[PDB]
Each structure stands twice: as structure tokens, then as C-alpha cells.
């Protein structure tokens, strides 16, 4: 049923991890849903670029041969894959300011913790790294060693938020 | 006739009751009108998020198993 | 014979974590060195308490029936046995200042990190935090991925310290 | 000889001195609850044994405490004497 005719999601070259990962996941998901072969998918790839990136594709066209190589090359030229110590310094710089919702803080911190190499941290030390930066509006009620998984922190945060 | 190809209504994370209820009712209505099965509908759900919420869906993907959940 | 006659290390209850930790450590090493048996150590315990704490031992003596529970009670009533999250929110708490010897900083960091549970952090993970907190008198000429062993940081820091 | 050493120096003062002494001092501010409850139990243990149950001591300790603790710890929550310290040290750590 077609092969990359037209869609809303495009890519520009904004140089950030979130936009690049969102675009790659959306394209990779669309290919699986619509059911397009691997050889037919690479011919339609300049139908998505609209910016500086199409000038980037006019030069590096002869380096790609398969779909996975082109996707890894798009991940390599733009996502700079920052090292570990900048991430560990970026988590401890900004505390949770007053009058901010729990869910935005938790999803931003989880998206920041996903950048580390996989298999290096469990769930328990993951929650222990995040339990040291919350406001005293939430730390007065729920103590440590009672919340065992990463869902129960939000489950008890939404109760104190409604109570005020 | 397709399965969540492209549409105007999307969701961002505006944190209000009206926008969330409108988006959920519009999606739930579109699924009933077009006639899509329950197993085929969950594979196409990241085609609608465009904001902070897609970062929210990259983390809580393994908690969902059915459409109602 | 002879068990717990007297020594220099006596405990007084000064409400600070350092003094109680040094007292528990010194008594615990003396127990293994001198060869005092487990059941005989509970009888000779109030020869050490010559302070306000000998009034305290008359109150809560019957709660302890073994040496381990008595040691845990002596820890619990005076020292709040700080968890991991306060340690992780206290390590990045302070930075490095000017005109400071690198050896004192590394000794303070490792002494503050060794209280974590053993087996959860190998040698590669620890290096990242110290490298991130380094004073830019040291970080300009000593970049990451040139050092692997923990000795290499001190061995390359002493040359930049001498060069002035 | 041990009883003769006890008899002349620590003379087992009567009950009304102890009862007038347990009310002659309130809890001053920035003072931790551990040394307070230790001194209060050590002064209350001079009474004749078997004259007071477990319930009667707790009300007196609660009445004695500073208003830093009474507004968050109300009466009838705690029954045993350990749970008062258990619910005090958490409010102390939270500060």
C-alpha cells in the first residue's frame, strides 16, 4: 500500500538526541506497520528530508547500501553519543524546583538515564539515584525502603499531589 | 483500509481534562468507524505522539499489553 | 584469662557520626584481634561506658540478648545509619576548590564512597564522577580515556602539580 | 559493704521530691529527643516498682515535649514506648 508517499514527520538537523530518536523510531515503526520491503524503503528516503539534511544526503549517497547501515549512519552523523561523566554531571546539576509536576520530572530523568550503556544499573540503584533530588513537599511523607519499584513512587506521588 | 496512517489529531501533554478527553474520544471513535482490530491498533500508537509524550512512550512501552490497558 | 580490661577507646555519646563509627570500628577490630568469644563479650560491656551513656545502659539492657543486637542497638539509638540516597546527593554536593592537593581530594572521595554496599560498583564506574568534579587546572591536560587504572590519575596529577 | 556504700551517698529520696522534679523542667528548644527520654526514664525509675503501668508513663512524656513535636504527633497514635522514638526520629530527620 504505497512506499513512503507523504507524511507529517520530517527531519531537519536540529542536533539533539530527542528529536533524532523520535524521528528514527517513528520511521522504523511506520515501516513495520505498513509492511514495506527493505530494498523498496531506501529508494524513498529523500522524500523525508527538507532542510540542510538534503544537502547532506546529496553527498553521502554512495556510502549507504542497506537500510540498517543508513539508519546507523543517520544516528552517527547527528546524535553525538555523549560520554558518561557529562551525563553523571548533568543529573546532579538541576534539582526539582517548586511548583512542578511529578510526571514531567520523572519522564525527563528517565529519558536522561537511558543514555548510559545498557546493563550497567539495576532498578534499585536507579531509584536511589533519583531519590536524592526531590522537593521537601514530597519527602516529608513517603520515606525510603517502602517504595520498591519505580511505579509506586509515582503512585504515591499522585496521592500527595491531589491532597495538597 | 489502513491502520492509523496519518491524521490531524495528535497529543502533546498539555495536562488538562478537556484536551485529553477529546483526544481519547476521537481516537476511540475513529477505531470504531474504520474497523481496526485490537491487536493491530497497538502497533500504530507511536504514530500519534509528537512531543514530550513520545519520550514518555519510550519508557513505559513494556507496561501495556492490551488496548484498554 | 582476661577480656576487656581497659583501653584508650572509650565512648561518650557525642551525637556525631564520625566518633560513633570510629568507636564501633575499633571495638570490632579489637574483638577479632584479641580473640574474645561471642558469649563472653556481653558481660564485660559496661566497662567501656563511663559517661552519660552508663545511665543509658541501665534503661535498655533487657532488649539485647546477643552481641549483634546489642551492637545494632548502640548504632540505632545514637547514629541514624545514613542510607544510599543521602550519600549520592552528598557526593556531588561540593566541588574542588583552588590551591588544593589532589591526594586529599581523592582520599576524601574514596572514604565517602566506601560506605556503599560492596559489589554494586566496579572500577570503571567510579572514575567518571571524580573526572567530572576535577578542578580545570587538572582537566585541561588530563582528558578522559587516557587513564584506566586508578593509580594513573594520581601519577599524572603529580606532574601537573609539580609543573606549577 | 555494698549496701553500706549505697545507703549514705544515694539515699533513695522520697516520692514527692521526684514528682515535683519531673515537672520542674520542660523541654528546651534544639534538644534531641534521645537524651531527653533517657534522662526522664532514669529519673522516673527511682519510684517504687509496681506502682505504674506502661500507659501512665507515655502521657507524661507527651505533655513534657516542645511544640515542634506535638503538632505532628498527636495523642492515641502511640501505645508502646518505642514507637514514640520511632515516630520522633523520622520528623527529626525530615527537620
Swiss-Prot record, chain B:
Name the major location.
membrane
Quaternary organization = Homooligomer; homooligomerizes into virion-like capsids.
Which Gene Ontology cellular-component terms appear in the entry?
extracellular vesicle; membrane; virus-like capsid
Do the record's keywords include Oxidoreductase? no
Q: Which residues of the full protein are shown?
A: 29 to 97 of 193
For this UniProt record, the keywords arranged alphabetically read as follows: Membrane, RNA-binding, Transport
| Location(s) in or outside the cell | Extracellular vesicle membrane
Q: Which family does it belong to?
A: Belongs to the ARC/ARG3.1 family.
Q: Which GO terms describe its molecular function?
A: identical protein binding; RNA binding; structural molecule activity
Under which name does UniProt file this protein?
Answer: Activity-regulated cytoskeleton associated protein 2
Is Membrane one of the keywords? yes
Q: What does this protein do?
A: Self-assembles into virion-like capsids that encapsulate RNAs and mediate intercellular RNA transfer. Arc2 protein is released from cells in extracellular vesicles that mediate the transfer of mRNA into neighboring cells.
**What does the UniProt entry state concerning the protein's domains?**
The protein is evolutionarily related to retrotransposon Gag proteins. It contains structural elements found within viral Gag polyproteins originated from the Ty3/gypsy retrotransposon family and retains the ability to form virion-like capsid structures that can mediate mRNA transfer between cells. Tetrapod and fly Arc protein-coding genes originated independently from distinct lineages of Ty3/gypsy retrotransposons.
Q: Which residues form the signal peptide?
A: none
Amino acid at each position: 500500500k504505497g512506499s513512503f508517499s507523504n507524511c507529517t514527520v520530517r527531519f531537519s538537523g536540529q542536533r539533539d538526541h530527542d528529536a533524532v530518536d523520535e524521528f528514527i523510531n517513528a520511521v522504523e515503526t511506520y515501516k513495520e506497520v505498513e509492511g514495506i520491503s527493505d530494498k523498496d524503503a531506501l529508494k524513498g528516503l529523500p522524500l523525508l528530508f527538507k532542510s540542510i539534511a538534503v544537502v547532506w544526503w546529496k553527498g553521502v549517497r554512495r556510502d549507504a547500501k542497506t537500510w540498517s547501515d543508513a539508519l546507523q549512519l543517520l544516528r552517527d552523523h547527528f546524535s553525538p553519543t555523549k560520554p558518561s561523566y557529562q551525563i553523571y554531571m548533568e543529573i546532579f546539576e538541576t534539582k526539582q524546583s517548586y511548583d512542578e509536576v511529578i510526571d514531567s520530572f520523572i519522564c525527563k530523568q528517565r529519558a536522561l538515564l537511558a543514555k548510559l550503556p545498557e546493563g550497567r544499573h539495576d532498578e534499585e540503584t536507579e531509584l536511589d539515584f533519583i531519590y536524592g533530588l526531590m522537593q521537601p513537599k514530597y519527602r516529608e511523607s513517603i520515606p525510603r525502603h517502602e517504595v520498591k519499584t519505580f511505579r509506586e513512587l509515582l503512585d504515591r506521588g499522585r496521592t500527595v499531589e491531589r491532597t495538597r
